[PDB]
Design the sequence.
RNA sequence: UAGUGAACCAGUACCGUGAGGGAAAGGUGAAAAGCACCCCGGAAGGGGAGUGAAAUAGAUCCUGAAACCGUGUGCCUACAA
RNA sequence: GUAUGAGUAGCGAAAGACAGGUGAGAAUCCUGUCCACCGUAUGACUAAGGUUUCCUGGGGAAGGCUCGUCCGCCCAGGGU
RNA sequence: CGUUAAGGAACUCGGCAAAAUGACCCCGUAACUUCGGGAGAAGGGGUGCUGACUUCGGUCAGCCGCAGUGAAUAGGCCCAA
RNA sequence: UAGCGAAAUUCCUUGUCGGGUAAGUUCCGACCCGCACGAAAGGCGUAACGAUUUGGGCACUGUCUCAACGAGAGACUCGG
RNA sequence: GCACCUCGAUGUCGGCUCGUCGCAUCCUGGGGCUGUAGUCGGUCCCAAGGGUUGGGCUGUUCGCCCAUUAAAGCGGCACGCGAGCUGGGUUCAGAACGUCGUGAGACAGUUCGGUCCCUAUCCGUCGCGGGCGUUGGAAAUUUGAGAGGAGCUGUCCUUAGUACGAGAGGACCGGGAUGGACUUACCGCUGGUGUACCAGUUGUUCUGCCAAGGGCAUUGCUGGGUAGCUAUGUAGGGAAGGGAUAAACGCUGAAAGCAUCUAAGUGUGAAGCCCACCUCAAGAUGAGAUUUCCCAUUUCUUUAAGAAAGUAAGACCCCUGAGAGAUGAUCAGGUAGAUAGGUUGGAAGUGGAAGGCUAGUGAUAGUUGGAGCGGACCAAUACUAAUCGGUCGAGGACUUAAC
């Protein structure tokens, strides 16, 4: 089928109350205090578990 | 009146003393702690709380351990009630062991069913198909929504929407053994439930 | 599991060989039938001589399905053909001889003049 | 498995011999006409086994009067007296369903 | 299980990935491929422990037939062929270890597809 | 959007094998004096500092309406056809 | 000129994975290995037709049904 | 796209669609006729590996499997108008 | 006139009798009151031939009684 | 019949799927009369709770026929339902016969073949989430205002060859056994599927070769098959009762010294009404009830039901997952640990591994040995992965009466 009418200006902003973005799980490190994701390797630190993993 | 909760284990077979095969389910139990006694003078009806398992102490709360603490047991999972029982005969903190159903033999078994996700309109209600050949295109559809005149759709025209998850009794089953030392009742037939679930077992209503 | 337009065989000396079913008597829409049930049926192929000829509305009773019945012991019988025996509604056959083994479950249904003619009652 | 094998040790029969699918076997089964109890006899070929513990089963095939007759049995009935292993057979299969389409001088089994 | 592709393409993938971690001992991939490679690498090193074959003649399926891993000379250029490394190095490293030979870390989403990524090591 | 179809590199671009059909597009300031130099950024773009009477005249550059899309807030709204 | 439909349908038949490069930035570019597809053709040579798309060195505003350090794209030089 | 118990055209306007036959060698083959045909009419049988014999062609003996053109390709037939 | 004839032609009509089926207004064989066949806008037979129209058998089977399970693409969640 | 209605475009009757309502009732249920001996019947009154079959011939509405059944109801819902299906037939462009027309052509006469599009915006219906309210903040257990489901029936034995009948025949009311159709739930048995389980086997290609193995050929084809999902398999369901009624039958009794079921009053009375059986259910804004847990800083705005901030009980974010699952939710866990993966044992399941020896000229056979392999299934074990962490979250209004 085919839409019957123009949807007004109100029903846009009544649909779109569930078109949000959310951040989840930001914690402070143990070694630099920089907010980095829990259960994840800290990117600038390189310091998961207090152990440097990215090693060559 | 008589009531024991429990678990669900599996399916077996048993030759009886005449020699016939009989399909048999396996239901466990435990010690069986009575938690409160509800009276007309405080609650307007008469019933008994009952609950069967032992949590670890990590897995409960200070309200739960305050509610249990007038019976001196561990915190227990599956708290339910029982109606229609003439009381007497029930202190706070007894044990309603497996001894109660030795010759009960006529029993209502009230499980909770499995779950099967979204499924089609056939598998809920047994509506038949349409033809799979001779040019058609109407293999597996839920039918037509009704007549034209009322300009709407009546209620209870069944469509898709999740199979299972609701609780179902089965009436008038028999009891085969009562094994007190192993905490097992054996039942003829078929119990609705996934494994490790709850099963309530009562003396049946319809005599 | 024997239905309309399903072909049996004859285990008699009554001049018929292969029969189509017509109905599944007893009930108001019964689909199938097992050992010891009664059929309305009509003869397709025949032999020279003999009593029963082609194109006759003929009652019969199933012996030897290919999915036999549970017994309360726990055993199951399964034969390798289908068969029928033409019956006068006296529960009494027309022929004077029955071939092949015959399952025991006619004795619950009181075909006691048929069972005493079988070679082996299984 | 843990409680089931506990709860069903009283009824496991122990005096049942060892037979592979493909061995000719007599069955001294009991026939109950209510009060009367007489004993029939099969002599067939063993085809199936279904390992389950309490409720294993097996099949036997006569060829009686041209028409094949097949009957299963559970192992642990009180309504089977004995089982007599008679012959043995070179067979490289576990379930011999291919015997239905054969006759007479072609459904023969070898001997060991 | 985890379905990823058609039937034979999963076998191709799990032979392709798990002959790395035998040559390089570190891999950067996604989540799901990593968990299947958990299972398959730990099933192959325990054939690495026996030394029969039956250790050779079952490892000739989930290992690429020849992929050279050469950092060695005595006076030659002698070759370790990605199975000989199992039956020389990775075998006797785990003579006292039971199961559990792998670690999985959780780094970043990929730029193009936002697929979250994973490092697999051994020890 | 008028006036030639054509105020501008118009019977052009483009469309059809062909005969043929055929558009849109004007304006910084008086003077280019069209932003040296510093900072962020790979660049685009921006913030200072200057030119200028004016840069909310910065090149899509006089004025800058309406639909349309955003930010902040004084009042109201979760038993209602 | 701008909405609604809506951040919906679609993204035009096919098998990829890892290591190391370059770079402000990489599943999509380069290199290496293994795997896979056609093989009376998805291999080679020419006639029409197209008209510089060919080669070398740069570039990433628009085109490429995504990304793009790349290109039959843009700039400069050069080849019959 | 792949498989199915028991029944095998009860579906349907209609066996539409699917299922079944299909390779080579050998035996055999009707009414009817314009004497060329019908005719691949219908209906049946054999096929793998090893050894010996062999002129040629195959025979004889032995071995294994549920299945031996073991995969892919390769006619369903008859009776009447 | 011969030759056909409830027909690709027949309203009444599901004409009437026989065959075929458990049951057959469709088909085949016969009869003749041909509403309204008919001799080169040809009449009546006919082997072979037909992706032609109609009736019936064998073999085979998810078309069906009555549905059940698995694989792949789309559908669903996140990024462009 | 009329022509108000829809021509900037509304599809024909049957069939498929799915139903729903009315009662002038087809069966089952309760009654009155009889030209009702019995078994059967004829007619009329109450009554809509459930049920109402497979085929053969026609495009079919119609119909006829075969075999069943307790019975094979009559109608409305755009002669129900094509943004759900069929496109069968009647109503396109080809062609032919009969008849008509001088002719182009025509005939509700006939015969073969014939292009049917749509990515749901709003209401509607089926399922599931977010927010807030429920007047201090939380974790559990429930009452039931209302609502939905289910409601059918045959055959045999006994009372009894009794009552009735000259015979022929042959019961009411009771008790018992056993099926048909429908329907709820489950995988121990019978079976099906089971594409990362086991074996056989053809072609070609690759790992240098022999031996052993991978790739591709619909999963290459063929024989079995675990869990999970399943029916045709298994078990159960409609029992038994209570209250007020319908048609009908009365008791007592007068108006009307009798009679008379009715006005006063007092009863029997059906598968139907309301319960009894199963399920949902306090957004039931009239927002219910019980048990258990947690008790106080700063600013003064001027103390008012003020703002602001760290907390308690507790919940959430994140992570390993399945008995759950379109996503979200639900449930099991998070080092006080068996949540998943691995490891060691098994089990189902294939059916005798590779190497070596013996017998054979060979194809092959025997034995070392119920061997080898073993996806989801069962136990034990912290080896790997759930660490570190953060966010939210009460200080309890007024009037009156009783104490
Ligand atoms: Zn850090």
Sequence:
């Amino acid at each position: 089928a085919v839409p019957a009418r123009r949807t007004s200006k109100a029903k846009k902003a009544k649909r779109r109350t569930h078109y949000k973005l959310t951040i989840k799980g930001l914690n402070a490190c143990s070694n630099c205090g920089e907010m980095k994701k829990s259960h994840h390797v800290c990117p600038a630190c390189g310091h998961y578990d207090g152990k440097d993993v990215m090693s060559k | 009146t008589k009531g024991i909760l429990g678990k669900k284990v599996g399916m077996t077979q048993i030759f009886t003393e005449s020699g016939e095969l009989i399909p048999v389910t396996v239901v466990e139990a435990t010690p069986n702690v009575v938690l409160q006694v509800k009276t007309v003078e405080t609650d307007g009806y008469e019933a008994i709380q009952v609950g069967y398992q032992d949590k670890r102490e990590v897995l409960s709360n200070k309200p739960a351990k305050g509610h249990v603490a007038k019976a001196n047991t561990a915190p227990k999972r599956f708290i339910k009630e029982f109606k229609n029982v003439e009381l007497g005969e029930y202190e706070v903190g007894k044990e309603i062991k497996v001894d109660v159903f030795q010759a009960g033999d006529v029993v209502d078994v009230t499980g909770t069913t499995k779950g099967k996700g979204f499924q089609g309109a056939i598998k809920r209600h047994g509506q038949s198909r349409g033809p799979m050949s001779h040019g058609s295109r109407y293999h597996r559809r839920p039918g037509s929504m009704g007549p034209v005149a009322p300009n709407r759709v009546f209620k209870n025209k069944r469509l898709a929407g999740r199979m299972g998850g609701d609780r179902v009794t089965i009436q008038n089953l028999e009891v085969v053994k009562v094994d007190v030392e192993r905490n097992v009742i054996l039942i003829k037939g078929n119990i609705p439930g996934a494994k490790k679930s709850l099963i309530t077992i009562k003396s049946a209503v319809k005599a | 599991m024997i239905q309309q337009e399903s072909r049996l065989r004859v285990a008699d000396n009554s001049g018929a060989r292969e029969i189509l079913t017509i109905k599944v008597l007893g009930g108001s829409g019964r689909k199938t039938a097992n050992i010891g049930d009664v059929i309305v049926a009509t003869v397709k192929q025949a032999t020279p001589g003999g009593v029963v000829k082609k194109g006759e509305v003929v009652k019969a009773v199933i012996v030897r399905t290919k999915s036999g019945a549970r017994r309360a012991d726990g055993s199951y019988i399964k034969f390798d053909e289908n068969a029928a025996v033409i019956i006068r509604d006296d529960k009494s056959p027309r022929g004077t001889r029955i071939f092949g083994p015959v399952a025991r479950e006619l004795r619950e249904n009181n075909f006691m003049k048929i069972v005493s003619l079988a070679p082996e009652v299984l | 498995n843990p409680l089931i094998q506990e709860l069903t040790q009283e009824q496991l029969r122990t005096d049942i011999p060892a037979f592979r699918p493909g061995d000719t076997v007599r069955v001294h089964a009991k026939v109950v006409e209510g009060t009367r109890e007489r004993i029939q006899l099969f002599e067939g070929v063993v085809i199936k086994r279904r390992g389950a513990g309490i409720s294993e089963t097996y099949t036997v095939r006569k060829v009686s009067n041209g028409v094949g007759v097949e009957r299963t049995f559970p192992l642990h009935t009180p309504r089977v007296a004995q089982i007599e292993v008679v012959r043995y057979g070179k067979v490289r299969r576990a379930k011999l369903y291919y015997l239905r389409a054969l006759h007479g001088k072609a459904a023969r089994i070898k001997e060991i | 299980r985890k379905l990823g592709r058609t039937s034979s393409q999963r076998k191709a993938m799990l032979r392709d990935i798990t002959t790395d971690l035998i040559i390089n001992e570190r891999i950067v991939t996604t989540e799901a491929r990593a968990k299947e490679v958990r299972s398959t690498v730990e099933k192959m090193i325990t054939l690495g422990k026996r030394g029969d074959l039956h250790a050779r003649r079952q490892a000739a399926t989930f290992v690429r037939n020849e992929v050279a891993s050469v950092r060695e000379e005595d006076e030659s250029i002698v070759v370790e062929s990605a199975l000989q490394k199992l039956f020389n190095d990775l075998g006797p490293r785990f003579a006292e270890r039971q199961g559990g030979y792998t670690r999985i870390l959780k780094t970043e989403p990929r730029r193009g597809d936002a697929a979250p990524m994973v490092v697999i090591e051994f020890v």
Summary: Chains B and A do not touch (no CB pair under 8 Å). Residues A 29-32, 42, 45, 47 surround zinc ion (CB under 6 Å). Chain B is about 10% helix and 25% strand. The first helix of chain B runs from residue 40 to 43.
